[PDB]
Amino acid sequence: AMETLNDIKKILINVGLYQGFDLTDPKVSEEVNHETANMKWIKDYTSDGNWDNEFKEDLKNFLDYMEVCQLALNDKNFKIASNSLFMAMIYAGNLSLIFDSIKTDISTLLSAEYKKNSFSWPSL
Amino acid sequence: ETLNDIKKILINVGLYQGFDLTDPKVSEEVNHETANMKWIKDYTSDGNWDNEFKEDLKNFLDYMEVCQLALNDKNFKIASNSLFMAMIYAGNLSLIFDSIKTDISTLLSAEYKKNSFSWPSLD
Numbered sequence: 001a002m003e004t005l006n007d008i009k010k011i012l013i014n015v016g017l018y019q020g021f022d023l024t025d026p027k028v029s030e031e032v033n034h035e036t037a038n039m040k041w042i043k044d045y046t047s048d049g050n051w052d053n054e055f056k057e058d059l060k061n062f063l064d065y066m067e068v069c070q071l072a073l074n075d076k077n078f079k080i081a082s083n084s085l086f087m088a089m090i091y092a093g094n095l096s097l098i099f100d101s102i103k104t105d106i107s108t109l110l111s112a113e114y115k116k117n118s119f120s121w122p123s124l
Numbered sequence: 125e126t127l128n129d130i131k132k133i134l135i136n137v138g139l140y141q142g143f144d145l146t147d148p149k150v151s152e153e154v155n156h157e158t159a160n161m162k163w164i165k166d167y168t169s170d171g172n173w174d175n176e177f178k179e180d181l182k183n184f185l186d187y188m189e190v191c192q193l194a195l196n197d198k199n200f201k202i203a204s205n206s207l208f209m210a211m212i213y214a215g216n217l218s219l220i221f222d223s224i225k226t227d228i229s230t231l232l233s234a235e236y237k238k239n240s241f242s243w244p245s246l247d
Contacts, residue, residue, distance in 0.1 A: 089232065
């Protein structure tokens with residue numbers, strides 16, 4: 001049963017292999033698309049990557065800042081409340097990005113634009 | 125229940141600006157300049173932000189799992205469709221946080237305050 005983001009990563013690597021490439025290889029997954037000046041693959045597919053750790057770290061930062069905001073409110077310190085809300089906002093954005101990034105890579109696999117063989121998805 | 129905890133604090137911030145987001149007359153009001161609701165998230169008592177997250181995540185994971193099972197069976201129609209639906213749910217997950225981010229932004233601007241509340245300038 002699929003329970004973690006790292007579980008999802010493994011399946012995406014497998015999809016890539018059907019297309020003739022191995023995302024766990026840094027020279028594949030960390031390669032720039034020279035035409036667009038952007039990374040071909042957004043997420044880290046190398047053995048050192050850990051998608052669940054990225055999520056938990058962003059979430060903890062988000063919560064921590066929200067908790068500092070409430071504490072500031074209780075003390076009537078609206079400077080710290082303001083700053084803390086601002087930083088929570090920043091980490092909410094990071095959390096959005098976690099999933100947007102995965103979405104983008106999935107979209108890249110679905111288009112098979114970087115395939116190295118004759119793999120083609122069936123028409124639906 | 126950590127998102128629901130966050131929601132409580134956001135409501136508390138609103139209260140200092142003189143409005144109560146738990147009141148649907150407040151949190152569901154439309155901004156007629158933008159034609160959109162002033163507040164994206166559901167702040168009413170029946171809402172459950174953690175449940176929304178859990179539900180989207182489960183659907184995301186469920187579709188990815190079907191994708192892998194389809195691949196093992198060399199069923200690339202089902203693999204394709206599952207990966208597509210997983211993509212849809214990854215977008216929903218991104219949107220959950222985007223929406224919260226936006227409402228936070230609305231509190232930080234104090235744009236909808238009902239009193240003389242002002243955030244201390246940090247320069």
